[PDB]
Amino acid sequence: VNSFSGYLKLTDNVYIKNADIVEEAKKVKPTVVVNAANVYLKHGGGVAGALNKATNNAMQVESDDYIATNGPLKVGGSCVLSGHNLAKHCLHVVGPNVNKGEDIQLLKSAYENFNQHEVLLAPLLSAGIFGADPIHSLRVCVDTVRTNVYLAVFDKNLYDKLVSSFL
Ligand SMILES: CC1(C)CC[C@H](C(=O)O)CN1C(=O)c1ncnc2[nH]ccc12
């Protein structure tokens, strides 16, 4: 038993809710919140900009130190950093950004990072400003992640679509 509430069960291990991930994170305090990151951990907009704003920019400060030490992430890769006031940990995962021409097949590799964590609160990778089809992203998530994932979808219209078109 865990503290996530109001989710629709899609599969044995995947759940979905129409929710603002920032507000869900602040209420739940999950062990892991996933950020829709870029390779530079520049958290300017989308989910990343919202998560970072909710940390009063502490996520960005920590991220800049991480990059200065380690260099950029790989597309399809991830790193674990602090969850600040939002979660114990933030798993920064880089899905491919279609608006940069990155290979959508790397989306499966991106979701594989979730399997290193028993339970996660997460957005749909490569959705939103990353330019992928959220329905394809949901399919890859379901077919790749084996750990328990609670997907927060900000847009109510998108959500209802994702649910109604799910197979
Ligand atoms: C619009 C879109 C589907 C695609 C772009 C955003 C991104 O990928 O960064 C995420 N997003 C969400 O609806 C979403 N879902 C949960 N929490 C969120 N907080 C801010 C947006 C958001």
Domains of the chain with CATH codes: 8-165 (3.40.220.10)
CA 127 / ligand 1 centre spacing (Å):
7
110, 126 Cβ separation under 8 angstroms: yes
Task: Report the nearest-CA residue for atom 14 of ligand 1.
Answer: 154
Resolution in Å, one decimal place:
1.0
Query: Using CA of residue 150, residue 154, residue 156, residue 160, what is the dihedral sign?
Result: negative
Q: Return the best residue to mutate from 97, 120, 137, 154 for the ligand 1 pocket (most ligand atoms within 8 A of CB).
A: 154
- Would the CB of 127 count as within 6 Å of ligand 1? yes
Whose CA is closest to 36, among 52, 23, 25, 17? 52
Identify the experimental approach: X-ray
Exposure string of 66-77, with b = 16+ CB inside 10 Å and e = fewer, is beeeeeebebbb
Q: Residue 9 and residue 16: Cα distance in Å, rounded?
A: 7
At residue 74's C-alpha, the angle toward residues 144 and 84, to 5°, is 80
Say if ligand 1 is within 6 A of residue 36 CB. Answer: yes
Residue partners of 137: CB distance under 8 A and separation at least 6 = 95, 107, 124, 125, 126, 127
**DSSP H or E run through 112:** helix 106-112
Name residue, tokens 């950029």: 72
The answer to whether residues 86 and 26 touch, using CB atoms and an 8 Å cutoff, is yes
**The pair of three-digit structure tokens given for residue 116, joined into one six-digit string:** 């290193």
Name the strand (E) or helix (H) holding 122.
Answer: strand 119-122
